[PDB]
Write a protein that binds this ligand. Structure first.
Ligand SMILES: Nc1ncnc2c1ncn2[C@@H]1O[C@H](COP(=O)(O)OP(=O)(O)OP(O)(O)=S)[C@@H](O)[C@H]1O
Lengths: 106, 254
């Protein structure tokens, strides 16, 4: 596994200190030798580390939204799509949202 | 008394209205909106006149308008083969004069007389049509009186007459740009004036969009069709007992 993670870092980042920042916790977090050996054999902690590093750039944000936020968002995006410049007011977002809800009820 | 049992069955069943609607387009896949719209077409209203003052229409005119490959011509070329006394006209090939009534001369008395046309020989049956948009207004006009006033009136070559055409109509025109911008609205997107847009007591702007849990089913369906052996298409009610069941139900005037 560790080899695979190293290769991943190389292909994407190609930067040692990044991998170093990844290693620091994995090593320092362990309490017993067997646990650390298990870790470096599986390197599972690198998964959580990548994830958290990645947690909320743009997808995690999108995932942590409730229903109505998502509705406003979708409808506003549709309004941006209609107009050429993408520039959409708030009123346009609301009107489109309202007619979408009218449809869902319909 | 015998056939009374057959009706008794096909009418005392609980879910006939569903058993019927999903059994009007055995080949077509789904569209449970439109299939309903058709099943209601063949079952007219009452056309009962008012107080001696006037008479009002009692018929329905569903008018599909759909994106490309929506199987909108299939419904027609089916109905016109299953609805009694019906007629299928491509429209743009035809002319308005032909559609309502023709005036022509006969050598018997050297006098002008009437040609029934699609509308008059389509009386008490669905007169389906294709590609309204393609039909220039010069022929779009000649229909209106066969929509609401229910009767055509003609004053040509000396003959003045008026013939009642109690005829359901239909349509399958395509949107303006062949396929219509989801971007644009619907107002400046249908390219048809207000009246003929109103007289259609249904409206079905059919879309066509991408998906997986749909397009897979649709493809499997079309394939099974082209796989003659897999004509599992048998719906509950045959395309025959539906006819007799209608010819009964046509008489209730609730
Ligand atoms: N929902 C569907 N399910 C199965 N087959 C379909 C469906 N829609 C279309 N088809 C097939 O694809 C062909 C095209 O159908 P249509 O789009 O109805 O053609 P059409 O009526 O000429 O359309 P326009 O608007 O007049 S060009 C038909 O021959 C159908 O067999």
């Amino acid at each position: 596994n560790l080899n695979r993670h190293i290769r991943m870092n190389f292909e994407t980042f190609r930067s040692l200190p990044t991998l170093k920042n990844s290693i620091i916790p994995l090593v320092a977090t362990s309490k017993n030798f067997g646990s650390l050996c298990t870790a470096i054999k599986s390197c599972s902690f690198l998964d959580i580390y990548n994830k958290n590093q990645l947690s909320n750039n743009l997808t995690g944000r999108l995932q942590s939204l409730s229903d109505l936020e998502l509705a406003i968002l979708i409808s506003a995006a549709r309004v941006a799509l209609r107009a050429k410049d993408g520039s959409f007011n708030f009123n346009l977002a609301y009107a489109e949202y309202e007619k979408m809800i009218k449809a869902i009820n319909s | 008394s015998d056939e009374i049992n057959e009706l008794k069955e096909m009418v005392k069943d609980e879910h006939i209205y569903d058993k019927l609607v999903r059994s009007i387009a055995p080949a077509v896949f789904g569209h449970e909106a439109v299939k309903k719209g058709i099943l209601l077409q063949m079952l007219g209203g009452v056309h009962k006149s008012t107080v001696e003052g006037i008479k009002l229409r009692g018929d329905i005119n569903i008018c599909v308008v759909g994106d490309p490959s929506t199987s909108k011509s299939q419904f027609l070329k089916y109905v016109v083969g299953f609805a009694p006394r019906s007629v299928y006209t491509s429209g743009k090939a035809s002319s308005a004069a032909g559609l309502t009534a023709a005036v022509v001369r006969d050598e018997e008395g050297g006098d002008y007389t009437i040609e029934a046309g699609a509308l008059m020989l389509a009386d008490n049956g669905i007169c389906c049509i294709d590609e309204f948009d393609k039909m220039d207004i010069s022929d779009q006009v000649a229909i209106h009186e066969a929509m609401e006033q229910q009767t055509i009136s003609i004053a040509k070559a000396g003959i003045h007459a008026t013939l009642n055409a109690r005829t359901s109509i239909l349509a399958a025109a395509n949107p303006v740009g062949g396929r219509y911008n989801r971007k644009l609205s619907l107002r400046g997107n249908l390219n048809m004036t207000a009246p003929i847009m109103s007289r259609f007591d249904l409206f079905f702007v059919i879309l066509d969009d991408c998906n997986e849990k749909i397009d897979t089913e649709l493809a499997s369906h079309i394939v099974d069709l082209h796989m003659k052996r897999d004509e599992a298409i048998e719906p509950p009610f045959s395309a025959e007992q539906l006819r007799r069941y209608i010819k009964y139900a046509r008489t209730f005037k609730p």
